[PDB]
Design a protein around this ligand. Structure first.
Ligand code: CLA
Ligand code: CLA
Ligand code: CLA
Ligand code: CLA
Ligand code: CLA
Ligand code: CLA
Ligand code: CLA
Ligand SMILES: CC(=O)O[C@H]1CC(C)(C)C(=C=C/C(C)=C/C=C/C(C)=C/C=C/C=C(C)/C=C/C=C(\C)C(=O)C[C@@]23O[C@]2(C)C[C@@H](O)CC3(C)C)[C@](C)(O)C1
Ligand code: KC2
Ligand SMILES: CC1=C(C#C/C(C)=C/C=C/C(C)=C/C=C/C=C(C)/C=C/C=C(C)/C=C/[C@@]23O[C@]2(C)C[C@@H](O)CC3(C)C)C(C)(C)C[C@H](O)C1
Ligand SMILES: CCCCCCCCCCCCO[C@H]1O[C@H](CO)[C@@H](O[C@H]2O[C@H](CO)[C@@H](O)[C@H](O)[C@H]2O)[C@H](O)[C@H]1O
Lengths: 91, 157, 167, 210, 171
């Protein structure tokens, strides 16, 4: 990737960042971002709790579909940050 | 408001009864509203004490108890919870209407004028009678409860 | 106005330009993300489901290759995995799928005028002109959607109860 | 070039003029208390003293740096702590009498130990309470970084919009109600922290009953 | 000026007679807090759910059984929920409800964004949008029935719960 092939994303003067920083998610509405963030956080917390807390994680038997979904907690964080960004962008 | 312009002075002598000069301490309209509410609640309480001790009953309560101990029995049963819900709704409306005008302009809301006059029975003489009956009921119900609580039967003496 | 949901209007991106455009997008997913990727994914799912449906139906109505295990299509996956032919087909489709990585990149970047779901397979010039292309693309996407739903029903019935071509 | 003795380290054209502008004073906030100015000679009326109380001058610490919060933020935090402490002291007082919700096989709300009362509940029951508090404190908080640097514009300190219409239209009575709020909140804060201190070390609050 | 239902109380700001069935009844002022279109959509949804629920409850208490539903057993309306969720047909009901609710989300989002769709207008009318005045009268009747039906189902299900397994009257 060359230095020229890069959009101007700097937003220090502005109060909020442009939607270009979201990449492919620039056009995603804020309501969809927020509701998906809530669903993702709930599902990931449920998966981690059922993997480690409710059942103590045994090496012989780990579900895998609970290991997946545990990654949605960072995804939920990103989704709610993007929800805020889209809310301030009015998009 | 000003207590000197209100209804409810001494009837036959015409002087205001504020020996302790507490009218100037608080908003006079609030004093009128609280006086009317206390009087009305005490008329209801007086009549209810007498009716319960008489044994009128209510459509649907089987519990028969003296008014001195009816509080505990009825709160255990659950009727007092429904009564509290009703009173809470009505007094939350009164909250919303009066508390925004505690120490400020009361607007067109006269103290105690809820507008429950469907039969068109309003009269200044009847307002005076309301205040006097409320005061008499406050004192009478005070006496009736502290006499019944000491174990005196229904006539209260 | 959206035809599928006549109580509201269709999004800005559903404009007829694409085949099978009934103005159906209650969630604005194609407004949220590029619609060419959506159409290519829809087409790919539909072709896989069409071929899966007809293959399931034939394997259940006896159609096997020489040197093959005579097994119902439900356990055909496991038996073919054990035989090893499954991995050969995995490589065969993986070649086309990596070429599809390249094709999708070119399509989205605009380096080529590639239509979604297009690999330039027209031996018989079945769509060499615009109106033929529109008609045949509408008919395909209809077949794609119908076969997708049909195969979902089939495989599930098969995994739930019974067997055979009917279920 | 502003109220602060030093220019903010935030740069020009990226916040400096936003931080270094004029800010409202402590005297323009409804917090004065007649009780502190309750002695012969100098004194106040209507429950308010002529001047506010600030022996340590935390209100005007912004002039040293913009690291320190503004009086808008401090009033927001004061009202938040007061409201939370009022609910907390009312809750402990009501719970210690033994009154509790009905309950069932799954949940048992019967516990008079306010310190260990949440521990008795199932994970879901207190989970809902904490989740509601987490969502609300976080949704109602918009423009709080603006109250820190001082821009009481978008957000008034303590005005979440919940029941703000019941405030009287007269300025005097509105300020009276706000002062009643602040006084009750501060009293409840002292009460709840005193009960907690009494629990942790006995004898901290001699008038305790819990 | 003043609320029609509560003349002693000042009228809510948001309520202005635009919506059908408006009487200015809002002591708590939640309309001023959260949007009124969302509130009316929720009101109509609750009313539709409750007023179908009343009919279903009374029908299956009387003894009307769906085709093949008799296999579930000697089920009254009181105990049908648990048996249905165990048998799994209630999961199919959840699926159909979600299918309808996708269009529900689309409609509410449209009317909040500014599509102009009325709250509760799902374009599913049975040819009764010929006249706007007729539609307005029907909407007022709908909202009145919704308000009645929420309370009716509340009383119905409690009375049934208090009486345990009980039939149609509850008297
Ligand atoms: C409080 C700190 C903070 C804040 C406010 C932001 C804010 C932002 N970051 Mg982020 N970022 C942070 C910390 C922070 N970042 C850190 C610590 C890192 C280093 C890891 C990054 C790395 C990073 C990158 C690489 C990019 C951003 C970008 C962005 C923008 C998009 C946010 C978004 O929703 O993307 C997140 C959206 C998601 C859907 C979630 C992504 C996937 C999750 C986090 C992980 C999933 C699992 C993983 C892939 C596999 C397991 C191993 C936004 C301006 C974008 C930009 O334009 O930056 C200027 C961008 O491309 N950030
Ligand atoms: C904290 C770290 C971090 C952060 C902040 C981001 C942030 C982002 N990444 Mg990610 N990324 C990360 C770590 C991170 N990444 C890592 C570790 C990897 C290596 C695996 C990647 C690899 C990666 C790729 C290859 C791409 C991104 C892209 C993005 C953007 C996604 C926008 C979005 O969700 O739109 C909304 C989402 C959609 C429209 C699609 C949703 C499809 C489903 C739901 C995905 C589910 C995935 C999930 C993990 C499960 C966003 C700026 C994309 C981009 O455009 O970047 C500029 C992109 O192409 N990331
Ligand atoms: C291909 C690589 C590989 C292989 C062959 C194994 C094999 C094993 N691991 Mg695993 N493991 C791996 C990678 C791998 N691991 C990785 C990357 C991590 C994260 C650091 C772990 C962390 C881990 C732990 C903590 C434990 C094991 C254990 C096990 C045993 C049982 C696991 C099981 O049944 O999962 C079956 C699961 C599947 C078939 C599906 C898995 C699909 C995943 C979730 C896809 C997504 C991956 C993700 C994006 C990668 C980043 C990691 C992310 C989760 C943070 C087995 C010996 C257990 C063990 O041996 O205990 C004595 C055990 O306790 N593994
Ligand atoms: C995964 C398969 C798939 C994919 C990728 C698409 C993609 C598309 N369809 Mg859809 N469609 C599908 C299956 C699919 N369809 C099926 C089975 C039917 C029913 C027969 C339809 C019927 C249909 C119609 C009638 C129309 C479309 C149209 C569209 C486009 C816009 C709508 C949109 O948001 O896309 C869908 C976006 C997605 C992210 C797909 C997944 C959605 C959720 C997450 C799946 C889970 C739900 C449920 C449990 C299953 C887009 C190209 C419109 C069009 O042609 O526009 C140009 C159009 O008019 N589709
Ligand atoms: C933590 C809660 C809290 C907070 C944030 C505030 C905030 C404020 N109070 Mg204070 N106040 C509190 C508790 C609090 N108060 C309590 C418990 C009382 C005693 C009843 C008072 C009594 C009081 C009065 C009488 C007045 C104020 C006023 C003020 C304002 C100016 C002083 C200042 O800068 O304070 C900043 C506060 C802090 C930085 C808190 C530091 C606490 C230190 C660390 C000691 C803790 C000791 C611990 C309990 C043992 C400001 C809005 C004045 C006002 O509003 O004028 C308009 C005013 O007149 N307050
Ligand atoms: C309003 C919502 C509602 C809800 C929650 C239910 C729920 C139920 N109905 Mg239904 N039902 C409804 C509306 C509703 N009904 C309406 C409007 C009618 C009138 C046509 C009926 C008429 C009806 C019949 C005749 C039967 C059910 C039955 C059932 C049960 C299983 C099948 C099913 O869910 O479908 C379940 C308890 C079945 C049942 O309870 O079998 C024992 C059954 O036979 N319902
Ligand atoms: C318009 C709606 C509506 C209607 C027509 C009825 C009708 C009835 N209710 Mg009521 N009820 C309603 C709403 C309604 N209820 C609501 C919203 C609740 C709160 C959940 C109740 C809770 C309730 C209880 C708890 C009882 C009644 C009972 C009654 C009877 C008359 C009670 C009385 O003293 O007069 C009658 C069958 C009584 C009855 O019939 O019990 C079997 C009774 O005990 N109702
Ligand atoms: C929803 C909508 O739209 O509008 C709504 C929203 C909105 C605005 C929120 C509304 C409001 C206001 C609300 C809810 C206000 C609630 C206020 C509340 C509940 C205020 C408690 C104070 C407690 C104190 C001061 C305790 C002192 C405690 C003291 C001084 C003690 O020493 C206690 C004590 O134990 C010790 C420490 C020692 C022991 O020896 C025993 C004693 C007893 C002596 C409205 C009106 O509902 C309208
Ligand atoms: C919402 C209400 C409702 C409606 C409107 C409705 C309409 C129709 C129509 C079209 C008019 C047909 C043609 C039809 C046919 C069958 N229904 Mg059905 N049905 C409803 C409800 C239930 C419930 C609760 C059950 C049920 C069943 C069956 C079975 C048995 C299959 C079997 O057992 O082999 C068959 C053949 C039972 C079932 O499948 O149980 C496993 C069962 O429990 N239905 N049903
Ligand atoms: C106003 C309006 C409309 C309307 C309406 C209508 C018809 C409204 C009707 C409302 C109605 C009829 C509301 C009943 C409530 C009953 C309650 C709460 C009962 C409590 C009951 C309790 C708490 C009982 C408790 C106990 O029994 C328990 C559980 C067992 C024992 O311990 C004994 C006790 C007693 C303690 C229109 C016309 C439709 C539209 C218009 O636009 C607006
Ligand atoms: C359980 C103990 C807690 C207290 C319970 C009682 C709570 C009662 C709160 C009532 C709801 C208060 O909020 C709601 O009140 C009034 C309803 O028209 C509205 O207030 C409006 O009406 C008042 C009375 O006519 C006027 O004085 C206000 O100036 C006017 O704005 C408020 O804008 C609205 O926010």
């Amino acid at each position: 990737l060359d230095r020229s092939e890069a959009a101007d994303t700097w937003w220090g003067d502005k109060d909020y960042p442009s939607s270009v920083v979201l990449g492919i998610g620039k056009d995603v509405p804020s309501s969809i971002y927020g509701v998906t963030s809530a669903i993702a956080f709930s599902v990931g917390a449920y998966c981690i709790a059922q993997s480690n807390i409710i059942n103590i994680l045994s090496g012989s038997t780990v579900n895998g579909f609970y290991v997946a979904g545990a990654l949605l907690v960072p995804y939920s964080w990103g989704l709610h940050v993007a929800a805020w960004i889209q809310k301030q962008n009015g998009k | 408001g000003n207590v000197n312009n209100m209804i409810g002075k001494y009837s036959v002598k015409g002087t205001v009864y504020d020996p302790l000069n507490l009218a100037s301490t608080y908003d006079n309209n609030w004093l009128r509203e609280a006086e009317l509410k206390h009087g009305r609640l005490c008329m209801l309480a007086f009549a209810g004490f007498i009716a319960n001790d008489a044994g009128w009953g209510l459509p649907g309560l089987d519990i028969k108890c003296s008014s001195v101990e009816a509080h505990d029995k009825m709160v255990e049963s659950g009727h007092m919870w429904a009564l509290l819900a009703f009173v809470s709704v009505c007094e939350a409306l009164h909250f919303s209407v009066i508390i925004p005008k505690l120490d400020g302009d009361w607007g067109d809301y006269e103290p105690g004028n809820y507008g429950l006059d469907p039969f068109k029975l309003d009269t200044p003489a009847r307002r005076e009678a309301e205040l006097k009956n409320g005061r008499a009921c406050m004192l009478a119900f005070s006496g009736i409860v502290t006499q019944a609580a000491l174990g005196h039967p229904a006539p209260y003496w | 106005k959206s035809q599928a949901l006549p109580f509201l209007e269709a999004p800005a991106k559903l404009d007829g330009s694409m085949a099978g455009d009934k103005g159906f997008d209650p969630l604005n997913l194609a407004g949220s993300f590029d619609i060419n990727w959506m159409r290519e994914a829809e087409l790919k799912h539909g072709r896989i489901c069409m071929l899966a449906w007809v293959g399931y139906v034939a394997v259940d109505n006896g159609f096997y290759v020489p040197f093959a295990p005579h097994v119902s299509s439900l356990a055909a996956h496991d038996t073919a995995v054990k035989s090893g032919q499954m991995l050969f087909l995995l490589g065969a489709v993986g070649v086309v799928e990596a070429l599809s990585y390249n094709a999708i990149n070119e399509m989205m970047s605009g380096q080529t005028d590639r239509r979604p779901g297009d690999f330039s397979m027209d031996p018989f010039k079945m769509v060499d002109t615009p109106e033929k292309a529109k008609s045949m693309l509408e008919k395909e996407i209809s077949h794609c959607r119908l076969a997708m739903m049909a195969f979902s029903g089939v495989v599930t019935q098969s995994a739930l109860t019974g067997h055979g071509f009917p279920y | 070039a502003g109220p602060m003795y030093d220019e903010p380290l935030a740069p020009s054209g990226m916040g400096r003029e936003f931080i270094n502008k004029e800010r409202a004073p402590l005297s323009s906030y409804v917090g004065a208390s007649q009780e502190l100015a309750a002695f012969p000679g100098g004194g106040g009326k209507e429950g308010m003293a002529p001047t506010p109380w600030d022996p340590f001058c935390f209100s005007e610490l912004y002039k040293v740096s913009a690291n320190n919060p503004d009086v808008a933020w401090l009033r927001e935090s004061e009202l938040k702590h007061g409201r939370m402490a009022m609910l907390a002291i009312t809750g402990v007082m009501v719970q210690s009498t033994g009154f509790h919700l009905p309950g069932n096989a799954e949940v048992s709300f019967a516990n008079s130990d306010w310190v260990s009362a949440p521990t008795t509940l199932p994970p879901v029951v207190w989970g809902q309470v904490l989740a509601f508090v987490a969502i609300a404190e976080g949704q109602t908080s918009e423009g709080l970084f603006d109250l820190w640097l001082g821009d009481t514009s978008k957000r008034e300190p303590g005005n979440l919009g919940w029941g703000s219409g019941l405030l009287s239209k007269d300025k005097k009575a509105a300020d009276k109600m706000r002062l009643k709020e602040l006084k009750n909140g501060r009293l409840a804060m002292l009460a709840i922290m005193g009960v907690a201190a009494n629990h942790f070390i006995p004898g901290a609050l001699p008038g305790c009953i819990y | 000026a003043k609320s029609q239902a509560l003349p002693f109380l000042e009228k809510p700001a948001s309520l202005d007679g635009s919506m059908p069935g408006d009487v200015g009844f809002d002591p708590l002022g939640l309309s001023s807090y959260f949007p009124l279109d969302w509130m009316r959509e929720a009101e109509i949804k609750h009313g539709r759910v409750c007023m179908l629920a009343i009919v279903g409850y009374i029908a299956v208490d009387i003894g009307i059984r769906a085709p093949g539903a008799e296999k579930l057993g000697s089920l009254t309306s009181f105990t049908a929920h648990n048996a249905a969720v165990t048998s799994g047909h209630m999961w199919a009901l959840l699926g159909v409800a979600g299918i309808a609710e996708i269009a529900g989300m689309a409609g509410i989002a449209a009317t909040l964004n500014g599509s102009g769709r009325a709250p509760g207008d799902f374009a599913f009318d049975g040819g009764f949008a010929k006249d706007a005045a007729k539609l307005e009268r029907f909407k007022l009747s709908e909202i009145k029935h919704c308000r009645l039906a929420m309370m009716a189902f509340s009383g119905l299900v409690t009375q049934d719960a208090m009486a345990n397994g009980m039939g149609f009257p509850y008297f």
